[model samples]
Target: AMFLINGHAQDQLAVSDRATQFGDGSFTTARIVDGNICHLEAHLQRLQVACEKLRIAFSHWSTLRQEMTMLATGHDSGVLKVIISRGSGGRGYSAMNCQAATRILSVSAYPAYYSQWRKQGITLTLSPIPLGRNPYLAGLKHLNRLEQVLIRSHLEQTDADEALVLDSEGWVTECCAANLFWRTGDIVFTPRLDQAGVNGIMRQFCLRQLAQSPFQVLEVQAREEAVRQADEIIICNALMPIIPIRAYHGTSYSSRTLFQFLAPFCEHPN
Candidate 1:
């Protein structure tokens, strides 16, 4: 209900909106804390990259940030959901009829599950649905999230905490809504996103944080077999900096050192 359509407070969007009609848009979700947007510039950079990938013209950061900051004002803790579409007209997939982009910004209550998940970790199950490869739309968080939606729908029927999905080629790409990472001995590994999956903001932070560390980071094309052999498994997003996977399909994982390693980068101490 905390929606701002094109800088105005509103609830409804045009039925003809391209994003509404054809999913021709990109979006970003971020955490707002104590009147500040967490990792604001990083999230904006991700949005810009997504916009470029979708060929949706993005606005200047000055304008975008100002609006975001204004909207975030007075909010102590909340969630920022930003959706930008390729404007109203399109002659059914023709960008020629499109105009300036349409931006929808909304603030909502922070998810209560995040804190519990961060502290206690979660159980994961492999998704039966496989992701299709689309290098063009691989990492962008576009409005088209039916794949994730379906995966989550399945999760709702299970007792598992999250679903780990694979690409059509069988490489474990990511979880339904977050990036995946694992450690085997002293080596840390994450799925290579060149073919599919989101390059999450928090995943970027984790990679950067580990870049100069003692452990060697490897981006591999792996399968569940590799995941099963991992000494530790972790999932990340902006809201939950890191959530260890205590078990996957009954196999236990230990992330004591991993948790200690990531505590510094977490928004709040674990």
Candidate 2:
């Protein structure tokens, strides 16, 4: 269930005043499986928190929950999205006290090529537009997204499929849109995005699952440490899970080059 507000397609919103001034909301990338929200609670919780922070009132939460529940029901698989916003064009920054929010609910199917990426792997480069270290806006995926747009443009101009963006401090904050983790051996380290980029939910999920394991799920200096020691690189997002990286910079990589622990999610059979 991946979506964006005012996405390329799908427009089902009402016009209002409250929506214009302080547009606060969130989106989700949930996939419906077996007529169920594969990760329903997590997505809903994120939206709720983002809305609360933006200080916007919502009208269709319960209705949306019900719709998602139905979409998951009886269907083998489905994709859906829930976008909450202040609404349409606003008069100014100071919105009226009585503002009506614009909620967007949409559904679409998932792409078929993710499995290929996981199996084949993709090349990426570290982009120049660094991610700024802002703990306040660290994890939430809000709408202010010019940096990502720029990174994508840069990647398009290169021979890379995606790009790793740096923070204002020259640290590798995250990939253009995804959270990155570098692997050398048994150690698994990712960028300390306490500064920028979307604080990935899947990254946390992996860390929690590996809590008592022998592995280390570290959030540290990406540019200096992760890049220097990286034997294999990886980028994981809600949509793309645990796809291996073959190279970083001038280094060429293959899924066959395993660090022992992460061999199962390999690029080639070792």
Candidate 3:
């Protein structure tokens, strides 16, 4: 129930909030563990990038920075969600004359299920919904997640732990809510986000770490055959960090010494 609005203590967005009206906004959901916001600077940087890509007029960057500091003053452990919208009072399909940007921040409990999935790997199925391509919006965490929502709806009827999503042209892109990396032979491969999916903060962090590691990781076109021939798979999110896949498409995979090898490069909330 902890919240902040427009850098002030408040609750509830306005009725005409453009984010609600047209999915015209972007958001970052990060961890607030032991009163520390994980990757605070990186998350803020990504937010700014998303705002620029979406053309949301966020003029109060300095205020937002100060407010974010005040807002998380005493948060032991929870999820911190910040949403930025192009203000209110815009007509249909027109963002003209919007007074100011709307900033909404909330602190809530982290997902209970994430722990279970992290501890004991997960089963995944190929999602039926294909991710529509738009290079401009491909890597930004914009609010247009109808495809993700639909994919979630499809998962609701299944017994799998998560769903693997593919682009419209039948290339494996990512999981429903995380970036995916897998091993085929000795090389680890993650899908290129030039066509679809969010280039997750955790994904970026890991990729940088991988750059210095002994193992070689490449961003390549992910097809079903890659998954089929993979020795292992790891899905990552800011919250989860890294999670090994136990099964995909009813076929089992092994993590081997991968998690142990990844321990040194694993991200932590600092």
Candidate 4:
């Protein structure tokens, strides 16, 4: 892996950086396919929205874009990540007198298992750890991800591929690292991220694709029971793009028609 910090080729960050100290930042990870950063515009827009919500003054758009392009173009197949830290220097939880926001760009070899999972699908188990509900911080891919860390730690001991996470109120939010979607006949249901979960770029793309398709897509606040009754289930993120769920607990989903229809939309230049 290689990293560029603030457009300079460096891997080190200040110990006192807000991202390290207080998780005061946001980040987006994208897939680089054939020297192109997939959905680059959407990823940048997500970062812009996150910076605005977190009140971080990061306006170096052109420079960031150039750096990202330079890093992505060097890799034929890899993962590209952009992190915007609120920069180093501040008194405790206060943001006063902080320097410019930090930009960290990195590219690494893509995980080979993603293609295998996409081909055969993956199994999911319910996470024992529930996500905390914070309306102020919900739907943003902020740096504070200890909850997901804990959930993944628990998952490591299990044989399931991914764990299904639920919000504090028992509403199914998403997977450990991906957005959740399920189809029931002609209607597709996805958990509403308004209360929790990151609003992933691929999720946004899939929603738009479904909007133009024959299926009716619904952003719902539902429980695990809703998924249990689904005719099909799929998980999506920027890296894997989309993968069908073969089973959850003991219930199995065998349909791939919906997944096949949406697969082409997930390709580049859509």
Give the per-residue lDDT digits (tens) of candidate 1, residues 98-164: 7788888888888889889878889999899889998999888888899999999998899999998
Off by over 4 Å in 3: none
Q: Best to worst by lDDT, what's the order?
A: 4, 1, 3, 2
Off by over 4 Å in 1: 268-270
lDDT by candidate, in order shown? 0.85, 0.64, 0.83, 0.91
Model 2 residue 163 CA deviation in Å: 0.8
TM-scores for candidates 1 onward, in order: 0.96, 0.81, 0.94, 0.98
Residue-wise lDDT of candidate 2 within 142-225, one digit each (tens)? Answer: 766667888888788889777867788887777876777776666767776666778766666556655655666677865555
RMSD of 2: 4.9
Candidate 1 local Cα displacement, residue 251, angstroms: 0.7
Ten-residue region with minimum lDDT total, candidate 4: 261-270
TM-score of 4: 0.98
Runs in model 4 deviating more than 4 A are: none
**Number of backbone collisions per candidate:** 0, 13, 1, 0
lDDT string, candidate 3, 67-145, tens digits:
7766666877777788898888767888887778888888777777877877889999988999999999989889899
Query: Candidate 1: how large is its RMSD?
Result: 1.6
